[PDB]
Design a protein around this nucleic acid. Structure first.
Ligand SMILES: [Mg+2]
Lengths: 151, 62, 97, 18, 26, 324
RNA sequence: AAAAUUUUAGGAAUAGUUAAUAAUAAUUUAUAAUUUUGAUUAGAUUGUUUUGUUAAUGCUAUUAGAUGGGUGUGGAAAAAUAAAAAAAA
């Protein structure tokens, strides 16, 4: 914690021309001026890219999505992390408990997805398979690079 | 500024016949360090206040 | 020549305004409680497209939700600047000459 | 009431003399 | 194809009036 | 479009009177007809979702608030972190309540709001940090490493622990086989004066033992005491020779995994903490918002009996009380 | 295991969902299932030619019971308390 100095010196010139220092007691602010409705644009926002919702226009957020967001892919343990996350993703897709999940064509879900109550029973496995496909198109050259020491 | 008016107002209701306090400290101008003031209030009340739960935090610049 | 009109219809269907306008009816868990609150004790207004319906059996013959009388010409005279006249000729009742 | 500083202040500017 | 946005605005405004029915009087 | 003050006046009432679905319908469809939603519009919507504990709806409001370039204040972060703690969880008989809560990272949004509260300059409250620790700990979630580091910096900021947070965090550590972290939690809550824990104080049997993390990097790098530093002795015990003790140490680690692999036949694959642990917030049983109840479990059905509030063949004003 | 018969002064949607199945323990298929001949939820709620009344195929009353996480024991959970149901001379 840094303490406020309290006093400041400002330069004042008289009518003759002599300059000296007014000592002004000043204190700094501590709280942001957020009560005004004007938006400056300089505030740290909250990340919500990892959340899974019922947005059918998006993909299901996998952990591999945070591993391909602009890192150094030539690092070896990052390749191992990508590999084990894709293995866990495919294994949790294969060993998924499909007891209550049913996929019948319902007419009322035409201009939307399945409803919010039937997300886990209708939308979950299809979004999981589409996420597996869309990650396989991004990862298959990292785990299995083309033949020209390996990672 | 050269003058400063402060207000210490707590609203005392009756929660099952027992008093509960909702206390607000309000300054008159900006610059006065409330973040350093609250930790002085917070250190004093950790030994002297017997209740279930209590908070102390800064809501505005004043 | 038909590929342009078919692709335009297929892109009009997948537009977000068409999918927002033709949303299904809101459930009772989506509206709120079991009832008593005005405005949230029923569902909202459901709009259907007669060529690509998102519900089966567009019309009904119930006592209170009876809607065959509201499909006739005159209720679509409110919006003739936005109207589609081929859908008006195919799906309307009591049209004049 | 704010105590007077031991240095000069802008509040003493009218006492500076024009 | 072009007049679906104003129809959507009229539908959402009707839904907002049906939600305004919660307030009751005035 | 009527008056925008009338639009805010109905939004002020529905967050105050009725449930969470009314403010989500009004603010979303009101945004599509052109009502400019300011911060006081989003704070009333986020008050209603934080009360009912809608963890999916808080993410959808905070996505729309950042799209409209509305800067949140400290009252907004007070509703985001406290609203993730009020989320429904737990298990009915073999039926998981709110199984879609796990794929949302609602513990991470409650942690993201705490980082964005301190970075923007606001002062986070003591009930935010207790509600942020709850979201890592609740029986659908096993995150005790992150909850210990959150509790470690909570004591350095001179916060006081909530009695609901200690009840959840003690049950998470005994579920994840941590008796040292659970005995140090009951020892901590008794010394700080947490209500309900002033009688539960346990002796520290791990006083001479080092931490489990510093054992592991020491084993990678006195050589007789290097391999058996993790082995716990009573004082009246001595180790074997190192060729005999290492054959005995792998005897125990194959017997522990043999006893942990056999399933209990009537548990549905659940720990005994998670059996009969259905959670809904305090709004579900005849109660409204209070600040000191962060993640308040709904009161039992034995609190309000029927036929003592209204006579026979007469309606009672409790529509959803006895329904769990 | 089946048929069968409930009520709401201001009447609308419902779903761990229907059928098939080389499928105990459903990674599949389907134009699936309930409901305006009144469903689901919410309110009230053991039912019962046993009660009362009347000239009355009308109106009006009810107290036999049961109980998916307390223990996989036991043939059967009905088990934390009952003046008999006399419980191995
Ligand atoms: Mg088949």
């Amino acid at each position: 914690p840094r303490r406020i100095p309290g006093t400041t010196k400002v330069t004042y010139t008289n009518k003759k021309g002599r300059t000296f220092s007014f000592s002004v007691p000043v204190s700094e602010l501590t709280h942001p001026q957020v009560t005004l409705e004007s938006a400056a644009g300089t505030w740290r926002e909250m990340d919500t890219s990892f959340c899974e919702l019922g947005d059918i226009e998006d993909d299901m957020p996998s952990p591999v999505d945070e591993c391909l967001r602009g890192g150094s892919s030539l690092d070896k343990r990052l390749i191992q992390e990508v590999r084990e996350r894709f293995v866990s993703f495919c294994r949790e897709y294969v060993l998924m408990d499909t007891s209550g999940m049913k996929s019948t064509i319902l007419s009322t879900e035409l201009n939307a997805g399945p409803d919010y109550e039937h997300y886990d029973r209708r939308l979950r496995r299809k979004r999981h398979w589409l996420a597996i496909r869309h990650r396989f198109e991004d990862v298959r050259y990292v785990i299995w690079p083309d033949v020209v020491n390996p990672s | 500024p050269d003058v400063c008016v402060v207000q210490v107002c707590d609203h005392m209701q009756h929660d099952q016949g027992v008093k509960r306090h909702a206390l607000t400290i309000t300054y008159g101008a900006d610059g006065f360090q409330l973040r350093s003031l609250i930790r002085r209030v917070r250190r004093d009340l950790e030994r002297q206040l017997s209740s279930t739960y209590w908070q102390c935090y800064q809501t505005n610049e004043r | 020549d038909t590929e342009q009109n078919l692709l335009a219809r297929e892109q009009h269907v997948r537009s977000p305004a068409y999918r927002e306008l033709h949303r299904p009816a809101l459930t009772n868990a989506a509206m709120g409680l079991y009832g008593g609150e005005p405005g949230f004790e029923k569902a909202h207004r459901v709009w259907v497209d007669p060529d690509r319906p998102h519900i089966k059996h567009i019309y009904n013959q119930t006592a209170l939700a009876r809607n065959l009388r509201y499909a006739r010409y005159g209720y679509f005279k409110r919006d003739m600047h936005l109207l589609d006249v081929d859908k008006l000729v195919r799906h309307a009742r009591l049209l004049p000459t | 009431r704010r105590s007077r500083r031991v240095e000069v202040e802008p509040g003493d500017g009218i006492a500076l003399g024009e | 194809t072009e007049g679906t946005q104003e129809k959507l605005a009229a539908a959402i405004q009707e839904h907002v009036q049906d939600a305004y029915r919660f307030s009751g009087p005035t | 479009r009527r008056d925008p003050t009338e639009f805010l006046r109905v939004l002020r009432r529905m967050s105050r009177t009725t449930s969470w679905q009314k403010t989500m319908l009004f603010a979303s469809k009101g945004r599509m007809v052109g009502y400019r939603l300011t911060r006081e519009h989003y704070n009333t919507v986020l008050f209603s979702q934080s009360l009912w504990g809608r963890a999916l709806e808080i993410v959808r409001v905070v996505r729309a608030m950042q799209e409209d370039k509305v800067q949140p204040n400290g009252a907004t972060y007070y509703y985001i972190v406290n609203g993730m703690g009020n989320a429904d969880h737990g298990w009915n008989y073999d039926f998981r309540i709110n199984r879609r809560l796990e794929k949302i990272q609602h513990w991470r949004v409650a942690l993201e709001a705490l980082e964005a509260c301190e970075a923007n300059g606001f002062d986070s409250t003591d009930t935010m940090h207790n509600s942020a620790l709850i979201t890592l700990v609740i029986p659908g979630f096993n995150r005790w490493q992150q909850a210990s580091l959150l509790l470690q910096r909570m004591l350095r900021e001179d916060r006081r622990m909530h009695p609901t947070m200690v009840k959840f965090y003690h049950d998470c550590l005994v579920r994840n086989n941590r008796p040292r972290e659970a005995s140090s939690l009951m020892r901590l809550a008794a010394e700080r004066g947490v209500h309900g824990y002033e009688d539960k104080w346990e002796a520290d049997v791990y006083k001479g033992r080092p931490l489990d993390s510093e054992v592991m990097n020491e084993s990678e790098g006195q050589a007789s005491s290097l391999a058996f530093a993790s082995l716990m002795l009573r004082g009246d015990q001595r180790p074997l020779p190192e060729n005999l003790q290492a054959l005995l140490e792998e005897e125990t680690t194959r017997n522990i995994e043999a006893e942990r692999s056999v399933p209990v036949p009537f548990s549905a694959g659940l720990h005994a903490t998670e059996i009969n642990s259905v959670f809904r917030p305090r709004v579900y049983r005849q109660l409204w918002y209070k600040w000191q109840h962060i993640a308040n479990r709904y009161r039992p059905t034995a609190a309000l009996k029927r036929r003592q509030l209204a006579p026979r063949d007469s309606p009672t004003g409790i529509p959803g009380f006895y329904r769990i």
